[PDB]
Copies of this chain bind each other. A is one copy, B any other.
Amino acid sequence: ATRILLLVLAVIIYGTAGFHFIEGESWTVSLYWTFVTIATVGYGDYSPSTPLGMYFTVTLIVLGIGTFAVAVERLLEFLINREQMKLMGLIDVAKSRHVVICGWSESTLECLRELRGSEVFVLAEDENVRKKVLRSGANFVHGDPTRVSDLEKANVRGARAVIVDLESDSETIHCILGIRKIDESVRIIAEAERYENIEQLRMAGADQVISPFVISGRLMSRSIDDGYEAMFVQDVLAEESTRRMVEVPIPEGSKLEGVSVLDADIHDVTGVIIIGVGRGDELIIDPPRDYSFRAGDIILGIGKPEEIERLKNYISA
């Protein structure tokens, strides 16, 4: 570890004391000479012509070779051990604005195509998951995502948001109960599977719960006959062919703070159906006529992307 540096200094004390006491030169020239011959520069103006110096320089050169051989084998031991540790996980995460994804499935693959690559750390235990993440462009941290000691190696104490989707519901509930032990304030997003588990996933402490299997189960059995809601939910939320469900913020100033929805009259002006307003971690779906807009509220609406731009200038100052 640290012994190579003391070996370097010991050979320096050997060379200086050998030059000064045999060639009879001063201290500074002996320091300069051992620092020029230890790097094999060889200017050649302070060379020892003395035969005792002619034999002493041989030992100085051979111990210089031995020192540069033990330092190189130490560097290669450290580099090979680090690039073999880092390849199969087994590393500690040191970032602080990153996104930790526990588990790996198709639903967490579709959220990497809307994020950047080296910002996202997938924490899982399988070996095929490792090759899929290293293919897809994120980082891999080998761990058991339920165990609290394997959550702190992904550093969820300073993570931006944590997205949890594991292979069952029991492991998802346990990962959320583990995450709320470390950092109480981080934002956790989970995926439920059964219908009866959404109440447990909220009581365990998840901030946002998505449940796609009950969505498709309710959309299948109500599309046997006509299937008109399925076209809406597919065309708007999944593919975004003709529409897109947007949420736009109301910035400071912004020319309509304090008026009602009747006075602004957004649907005839722009063409965007306002669904609701999000005043601070709640949603008023279909706000009434007597709602007055504030600062920092967010209008949720559906429209073609050229109507979203016509709304984003009607709000802006």
Which residues does A use to contact B, with CB under 8 Å? Answer: 28-29, 31-32, 35-37, 39-45, 47, 49, 51, 54-55, 57-58, 61-62, 64-65, 69, 72-73, 75-77, 79-81, 83-84, 87-90, 99, 105-111, 114-115, 131, 134-135, 142-143, 146-148, 150, 160-161, 163, 165, 168-171, 173-174, 177-178, 181, 187, 189, 191, 193-196, 198-200, 207-239, 242-243, 245, 247, 271, 273, 275-276, 278, 281, 283, 285-286, 298, 300, 302-303
Number of copies: 5
Say yes or no: A230 contacts B216, CB within 8 Å: no
A245 with B217: in contact, given A35-B61, A41-B61, A58-B31 (CB under 8 Å)?
no
Q: Complex Cα distance A213/B191, Å?
A: 10
A138 to chain B minimum Cβ distance, whole angstroms, is: 13
Residues of B within 8 A of A109 (CB): 217
Cβ A210 vs Cβ B221 within 8 A = no
In the assembled complex, the CB of A130 is this many whole angstroms from the nearest CB of chain B, namely 10
- B77-A83 in contact (CB<8A): yes
Which B-chain residue is minimally distant from A197 (CB atoms)? B174
Does A61 lie within 8 Å of B39, measured CB to CB?
A: yes
A32 in contact with B57 (CB, 8 Å):
yes
Q: How far is the CB of A55 from chain B (nearest CB, A)?
A: 8
With A131-B88, A131-B142, A300-B232 given, is the CB distance from A37 to B41 under 8 Å?
A: yes
In the complex, what residues of B have CB within 8 A of residue A39's CB? Answer: 40, 61, 64-65
Select one of B110, B187, B217 contacting A214, CB under 8 A: B110
